[PDB]
Amino acid sequence: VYLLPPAREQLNLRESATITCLVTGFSPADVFVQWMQRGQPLSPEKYVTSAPMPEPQAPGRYFAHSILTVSEEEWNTGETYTCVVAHEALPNRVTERTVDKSTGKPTLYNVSLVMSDTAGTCY
Amino acid sequence: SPIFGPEEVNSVEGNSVSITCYYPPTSVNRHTRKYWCRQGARGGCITLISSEGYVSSKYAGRANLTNFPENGTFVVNIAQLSQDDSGRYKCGLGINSRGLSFDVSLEVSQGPGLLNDT
Amino acid sequence: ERIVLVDNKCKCARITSRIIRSSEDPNEDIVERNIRIIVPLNNRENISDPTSPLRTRFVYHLSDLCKETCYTYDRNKCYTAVVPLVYGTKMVETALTPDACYPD
Numbered sequence: 146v147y148l149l150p151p152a153r154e155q156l157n158l159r160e161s162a163t164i165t166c167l168v169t170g171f172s173p174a175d176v177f178v179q180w181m182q183r184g185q186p187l188s189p190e191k192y193v194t195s196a197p198m199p200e201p202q203a204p205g206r207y208f209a210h211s212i213l214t215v216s217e218e219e220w221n222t223g224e225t226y227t228c229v230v231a232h233e234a235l236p237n238r239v240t241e242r243t244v245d246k247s248t249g250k251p252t253l254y255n256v257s258l259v260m261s262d263t264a265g266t267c268y
Numbered sequence: 269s270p271i272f273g274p275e276e277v278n279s280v281e282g283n284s285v286s287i288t289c290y291y292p293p294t295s296v297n298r299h300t301r302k303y304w305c306r307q308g309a310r311g312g313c314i315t316l317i318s319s320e321g322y323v324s325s326k327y328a329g330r331a332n333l334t335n336f337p338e339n340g341t342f343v344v345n346i347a348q349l350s351q352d353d354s355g356r357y358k359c360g361l362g363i364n365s366r367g368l369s370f371d372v373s374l375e376v377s378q379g380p381g382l383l384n385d386t
Numbered sequence: 387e388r389i390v391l392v393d394n395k396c397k398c399a400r401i402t403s404r405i406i407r408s409s410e411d412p413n414e415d416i417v418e419r420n421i422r423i424i425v426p427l428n429n430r431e432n433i434s435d436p437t438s439p440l441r442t443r444f445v446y447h448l449s450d451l452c453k454e455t456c457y458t459y460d461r462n463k464c465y466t467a468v469v470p471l472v473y474g475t476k477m478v479e480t481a482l483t484p485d486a487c488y489p490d
């Protein structure tokens with residue numbers, strides 16, 4: 146199971162944000178998938194998902210999807226939205242993953258170079 | 269930070285003034301530069317009097333500076349004040365560029381009066 | 387208000403720290419490690435032998451000095467290198483920095 150945060154393009158009209166609990170690379174089929182939120186499962190009515198689509202490239206394998214329309218602020222405040230997958234090809238048969246704003250944001254850092262500008266402040 | 273002196277000192281023109289600033293009595297502070305500098309909106313102390321002898325050209329005869337290592341002190345005497353002397357100053361030691369120093373404010377005002385009725 | 391984690395007066399390093407107690411929100415504060423170095427680009431590599439090259443590299447394994455070849459003349463403890471004088475030869479002392487080697 147993977148997970149991609151909503152497209153920044155969506156986060157410019159500031160109504161809704163969509164999240165893609167991509168599921169793939171597995172066999173057999175009949176994967177159920179559910180979305181946790183701090184231990185609280187959402188309703189299946191909150192989100193939508195596919196059926197196991199036969200995978201083109203990986204031959205004897207299936208894949209599916211699911212989405213959920215989190216609104217702008219409703220993603221902008223934390224709320225990691227764990228996505229949990231139920232299948233039979235796992236040791237404990239289950240897995241779950243999650244995301245937030247700050248899944249990336251990797252080390253933004255403003256260097257600064259200064260000369261010839263006496264600011265009247267120590268260093 | 270380890271330098272210590274009076275924050276603001278006021279006097280009026282024509283008078284003398286004497287300022288004392290303190291340093292820990294260690295060996296170097298008993299045997300190294302003391303200075304009185306004046307800053308502004310231009311970025312830098314301009315030195316006005318030094319413990320090494322140099323006196324600013326505008327302060328010749330006006331003022332001098334003496335060090336009493338036994339008191340852990342150095343003293344600055346200014347006489348013949350004017351309203352052109354009011355501004356922000358600093359006592360300090362060592363190289364002016366660092367801050368082993370202490371900031372002083374100075375406000376000079378004219379000698380009022382002229383009113384025999386009060 | 388800061389907390390000087392290290393103040394190495396023979397590297398002129400000074401790692402302080404200060405929790406920026408935020409706007410009075412809950413505990414979404416971030417602690418903050420200020421650093422500061424004043425590298426000389428004037429001195430030797432043998433700080434106490436002015437017959438060596440100057441310096442190019444200035445390496446700060448902060449791990450090492452978060453606790454001896456360090457390269458600023460510390461102000462308070464002073465240095466010297468015995469130096470020959472000739473008036474005849476004599477092998478005699480010096481005082482490589484003043485105003486701190488004063489036996490007083």
Ligand SMILES: *[C@@H]1O[C@H](CO)[C@@H](O[C@@H]2O[C@H](CO)[C@@H](O)[C@H](O)[C@H]2NC(C)=O)[C@H](O)[C@H]1NC(C)=O
Pocket residue numbers: 432433434435466467
């Ligand atoms: C290079 O530095 C080392 C240590 O930093 C110096 O070693 C000793 O320094 C003391 C200083 O008083 C002298 O009394 C010793 O005679 C030095 N020992 C040796 C073996 O030299 C060393 O002197 C420095 N280099 C030079 C050329 O002096």
